[PDB]
């Protein structure tokens, strides 16, 4: 439903990943993610869903990679 | 770049024996938007496509999503 810029950064920090690496694993551009992390735009509802999914279920990154 | 065809979107939903409205709500979109994706009038945004292919290959994902 909702996720703040600080929370988006924190998800990435669980994985000890740089922005570019995390973005790539989410099939999202680095710059789009930067905009979200920096509070310049809001992610769409499916992106929020995706970030929240990865947060709680880290194995989702691997699933994505194998798509 | 990931892609999912309109027919594939319909098949995923039917596989979940789910109405268009419920599936849409779980994906955080409207039934009207999902209908556009299913009929090929629109293509989902990139994160939407990713979610769809996940739910397609990993069914348990829908359960995870429901509980976020």
Curated annotation (Swiss-Prot), chain A:
Name the gene.
higA-2
Extra remark: HigB-2/HigA-2 has been shown to stabilize plasmids very efficiently in E.coli.
State what this protein does.
Answer: Antitoxin component of a type II toxin-antitoxin (TA) system that counteracts the effect of the HigB-2 toxin. Binds to its own promoter and regulates transcription of the higB-2/higA-2 operon.
**Keywords associated with the record:** DNA-binding, Toxin-antitoxin system, Transcription, Transcription regulation
**Statement: the UniProt record of this protein carries the keyword Nuclease:** no
Tell me yes or no: is Hydrolase among this UniProt entry's keywords. Answer: no
Residues annotated as DNA-binding are 19-38
Give one GO term, molecular function aspect.
DNA binding
Relate the induction remark in this record. Answer: Induced by amino acid starvation and the protein synthesis inhibitor chloramphenicol.
Q: Where is the HTH cro/C1-type domain?
A: 8-61
This protein's species is Vibrio cholerae serotype O1 (strain ATCC 39315 / El Tor Inaba N16961)
- Entry protein name: Antitoxin HigA-2
């Amino acid at each position: 439903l909702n996720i703040s810029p600080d929370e988006i950064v924190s998800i990435r920090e669980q994985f000890n990943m740089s922005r570019g690496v995390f973005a790539r694993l989410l099939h999202t551009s680095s710059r789009t993610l930067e905009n979200w992390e920096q509070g310049r735009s809001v992610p769409n509802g499916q992106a929020v869903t995706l970030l929240k999914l990865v947060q709680r279920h880290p194995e989702t990154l691997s699933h994505i990679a194998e798509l």
